[PDB]
């Protein structure tokens, strides 16, 4: 029951505290400068020092993942089941979209027309170029049979269309683009819907209760528009003012029913269904990862000192675990533990191979270095001192002259702030000389040489000076070709080339040449 005594007690038992900790606990009556700055002196006379949540995320992450309940052998099957139920739902949602099929057919029309490759359009269906060329025709056939049924008999063929479209394993990029296209189309639908909506409720003064009444099921026709406004309602006669805008913007709304080959009613349903599926999927998968977060740490504890931080390792490893959850199928019976282990380890190793170096080197380089490091172990005490630098790669399958270069670039650069001898503020980089700088003496000699050469060029004839300056970059930008010189000089060719040699001779004699001679040091 004292504030000060608490401050000093912490600062006595520990002995040792920081400015902030002292500022945290201060007498009720001390808020100001001399009332603290002196209290420090008071404290720094006895027990002298001056300078839950522990911060460092190594803790917080460990605790936050420490919450998550470990799975059960059967629970994994539950979650994976939720996954299966989730995904293939959005796959079916894709298969029920006409533009999704037509896009595939058109892109394949581009494939056979040599405007693109197969690898970009497919990974193979349930599995050959010929088999592909045929199976694709099967798909096209099941499309062209359902295309003419648009007239209650079509719901039967649409099933089989979905079936054959589902048999295709699309390139992930393409599938992504398809889903994107669908959702974007939905966003357009919402553009028109909201535009029409705000011209009634937000402007024209009319309830959303009555607005959606005749809206659902048509929205394209004038049943809710031309057959409505005459109804003698308080919100009815107000609809005349904007009646132009809505009717003009309705065209695109019914145009979507053409482009997508689906009524506005159906579109929203399909895309919403797909959203539900996707959400379900991710919802299960995350839950799968969070349970296995421990394995990642257990693996990462091996790779600690390789030049990456602990949390970096566990995060890259977490990404690996995510990949494992994405590519895993419980139907194969493979234990998820021993499976995902390799994935996490792979992500870790592959990442360390990359970002642990100031100068990043290719993977095969790292491996090639590793092998040499291993060979140099066995011959260490075997040779009595160490194997000669030119005896390593003999056992390696390469020209063997690499050992030098490989041993050279591999060494990491030394910290420029590394303390050098004398233990003073002297640091390594402080002794790094600037070579790229042009010393002032030389920079002066250059100016003097400019003036000198100018003077020597002032002695020749006007045309000799002009042509000799033109042959070089003297007092001009971009020294000109011997033909160009003539082009500017009128008379051309072998003429100019002569004057050059005629100038040099006149400047060769130790009268005009003696001045700049000493520059030849």
């Amino acid at each position: 029951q004292s504030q000060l005594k608490l401050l000093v007690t912490r600062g006595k038992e520990q002995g040792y505290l920081t400015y902030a900790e002292v500022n945290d606990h201060l007498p009720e009556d001390i808020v100001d400068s001399d009332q603290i700055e002196d209290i420090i002196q008071m404290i720094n006379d006895m027990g002298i020092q001056v300078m839950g949540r522990t911060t460092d995320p190594v803790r917080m992450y460990m605790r936050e993942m420490g919450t998550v309940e470990l799975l059960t052998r059967e629970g994994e099957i539950d979650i994976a089941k939720r996954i299966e139920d989730g995904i293939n739902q959005v796959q079916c949602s894709v298969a029920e979209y006409p533009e999704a099929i037509t896009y595939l057919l058109e892109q394949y029309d581009r494939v056979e027309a040599e405007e693109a490759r197969l690898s970009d359009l497919i990974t193979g269906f349930v599995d050959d170029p010929e088999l592909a060329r045929e199976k694709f025709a099967e798909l096209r056939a099941q499309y062209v049979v359902t295309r003419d049924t648009i007239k209650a008999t079509a719901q039967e063929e649409i099933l089989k269309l979905s079936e054959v479209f589902k048999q295709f394993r699309l390139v992930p990029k393409q599938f992504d683009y398809l889903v994107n296209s669908m959702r974007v189309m939905m966003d357009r639908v919402r553009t028109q819907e909201r535009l029409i909506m705000k011209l009634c409720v937000e402007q024209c003064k009319m309830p959303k209760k009555n607005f959606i009444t005749l809206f659902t099921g048509n929205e394209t026709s004038d049943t809710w528009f031309n057959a409505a406004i005459a109804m003698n309602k308080p919100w009815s006669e107000k609809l005349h003012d904007v009646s132009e805008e809505v009717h003009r913007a309705l065209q695109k709304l019914q145009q979507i029913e053409e482009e997508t080959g689906l009524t506005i009613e159906q579109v929203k349903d399909i895309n919403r269904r797909m959203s539900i599926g996707e959400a379900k999927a991710r919802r299960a998968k995350k839950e799968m990862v969070e349970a296995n977060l421990r394995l990642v740490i257990s693996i990462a504890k091996k790779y600690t000192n390789r030049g990456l931080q602990f949390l970096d390792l566990i995060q890259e490893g977490n990404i690996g675990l995510m990949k494992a959850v994405d590519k895993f199928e419980y139907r194969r019976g493979y234990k998820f533990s021993t499976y995902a282990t390799w994935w996490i380890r792979q992500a870790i190793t592959r990442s360390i191979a990359d970002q642990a170096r100031t100068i990043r080197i290719p993977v095969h380089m790292i491996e090639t270095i590793n092998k040499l490091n291993r060979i140099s172990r066995q011959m260490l005490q075997e040779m009595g001192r160490e194997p000669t630098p030119e005896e390593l790669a003999e056992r390696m399958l390469m020209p063997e002259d690499k050992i030098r270069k490989v041993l050279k670039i591999a060494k990491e650069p030394i910290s420029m702030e590394t303390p050098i001898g004398d233990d003073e503020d002297s640091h390594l980089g402080d002794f790094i000389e600037d070579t790229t700088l042009e010393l002032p003496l030389d920079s002066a000699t250059t100016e003097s040489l400019r003036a000198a050469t100018h003077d020597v060029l002032a002695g020749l004839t006007a045309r000799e000076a002009k042509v000799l300056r033109m042959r070089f970059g003297i007092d001009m930008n971009t020294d000109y070709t011997l033909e160009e010189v003539g082009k500017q000089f009128d008379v051309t060719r072998e003429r100019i080339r002569q004057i050059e040699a005629k100038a040099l001779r006149k400047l060769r004699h130790p009268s005009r040449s003696e001045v700049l001679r000493s520059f030849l040091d």
Partner: protein, 50 residues
């Protein structure tokens, strides 16, 4: 306020102690000083002709 003269260690100094009475100022000083191992020497009222 009241300036309380506290002396400890190698040297001394005065710290402001707010209170409604000289006696109260002394009590609030000691309660907020003595237990830390700091000696309470003097207590003075703040003058300041105004």
């Amino acid at each position: 306020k009241f300036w309380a003269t506290v002396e400890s260690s190698e040297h001394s100094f005065e710290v402001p102690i707010y209170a409604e009475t000289l006696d109260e100022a002394l009590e609030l000083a000691e309660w907020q000083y003595v237990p830390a191992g700091f000696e309470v020497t003097r207590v003075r009222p703040c003058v300041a002709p105004k």
